[PDB]
């Protein structure tokens, strides 16, 4: 039972920059260390084994170093396909404990969200439900706030928000907001506004519809 303290927890670098992740072992693990890359919704991929030996078909911009307890991974010419969570694992003792992980963000230029708002579908209405959906797509950085205004007044509850992980193609994020009402609360109001706040724009982005097109 050896412990694996990995560092940093999160990182953010532009393509072409050089980054250095570190795993510390609580005892000596005599180079018996592997680094893995895990892409969202995919299995982990080996990068380096035995501390410094590159795995099959791994580009030379990757290299690991260190010895004893102190180990680190280096990436020199950071490329698009490198995003993800990097783990370390040891095989010295009988318990092959992983480090906690180092999640790697791709840094990109600021982008305002494309906001889109959608009234409840007729099918859902006709069953008695009414969800208003608002997408806030392809924005950067990750930090964002959305609020709902119904006939001018801020609405708190019913709202369910969800966020994607960084996009593999354009390195943006995207967010989804769902305000669920009953059909007959929905029909008691006309103006529904999805209002987004982001650092790209000092004045908030506003998308609305009237219940009567």
């Amino acid at each position: 039972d050896i412990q694996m303290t990995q560092s940093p927890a999160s990182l953010s670098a532009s393509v072409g920059e050089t980054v250095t992740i570190t795993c510390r072992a609580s005892g000596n693990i005599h180079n018996y260390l592997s680094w893995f890359q895990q892409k969202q919704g995919k299995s982990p991929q080996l990068l380096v084994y035995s501390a410094k030996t590159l795995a099959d078909g791994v580009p030379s911009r990757f290299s690991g170093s260190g010895s004893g307890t102190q180990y680190s991974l280096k990436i020199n010419s950071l490329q698009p396909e490198d995003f993800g969570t990097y783990y370390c694992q040891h095989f010295w003792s009988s318990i092959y404990t992983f480090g906690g992980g180092t999640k790697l963000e791709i840094k990109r230029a600021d982008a305002a969200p494309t906001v889109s708002i959608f009234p409840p579908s007729s099918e859902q209405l006709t069953s008695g439900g009414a969800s208003v959906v608002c997408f806030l797509n392809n924005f950067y950085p990750k930090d964002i706030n959305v609020k709902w205004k119904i006939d001018g007044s801020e609405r708190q509850n019913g709202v369910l928000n969800s966020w994607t992980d960084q996009d593999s193609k354009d390195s943006t994020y995207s967010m989804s907001s769902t305000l669920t009402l009953t059909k007959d609360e929905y029909e008691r109001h006309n103006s529904y506004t999805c209002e987004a706040t982001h650092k790209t724009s000092t004045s908030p982005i506003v998308k609305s519809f009237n219940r009567n097109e």
Partner: protein
Amino acid sequence: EVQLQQSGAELVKPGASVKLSCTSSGFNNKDTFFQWVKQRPEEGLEWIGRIDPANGFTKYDPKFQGKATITVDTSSNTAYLQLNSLTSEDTALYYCTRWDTYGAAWFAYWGQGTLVTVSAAKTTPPSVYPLAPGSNSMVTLGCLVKGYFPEPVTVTWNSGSLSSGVHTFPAVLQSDLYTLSSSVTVPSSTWPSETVTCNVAHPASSTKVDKKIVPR
């Protein structure tokens, strides 16, 4: 080719037990261990244990000693992972990983994963609604997938034809039911002139739904 073939998703009641499997093919080294690893969503990889196929000897992390039981069939080159006295804490994705040797080089292969959900809540098919806008060059269309349990569903557009421009979001649980959305962005010359369709599968309830995005 060398590859690890796992079993399909599992749904089970609290207190029950389950037995996942992991098959291998074409490994050069017969002595390498099958290992099992637990991952909760947005959490770290967590080593469970391993087995030595030469003799059936196993090691476990103390946290899984008694919880996990790893078995093998070297006869068939398949290895199983039984979990017992299940709770919600055991809900996670479970990988089988195994190393291999050719010459003086190492190789690390991983299975696809095998999801395990532990809950007393009833299987429920999803209600899928289209999202067309009311009154730009590209137009964004949407799909709302609401009221299902358990995770996962799979969302595609035009039977997977529309692969770029897609954003499918993580499900959110509330009151024993998931709600999920997916957006697609396509050229204005494409819709409504052509048919754009939302495909949803929910294997747990054997549901397959196509929802056309009809305008207005």
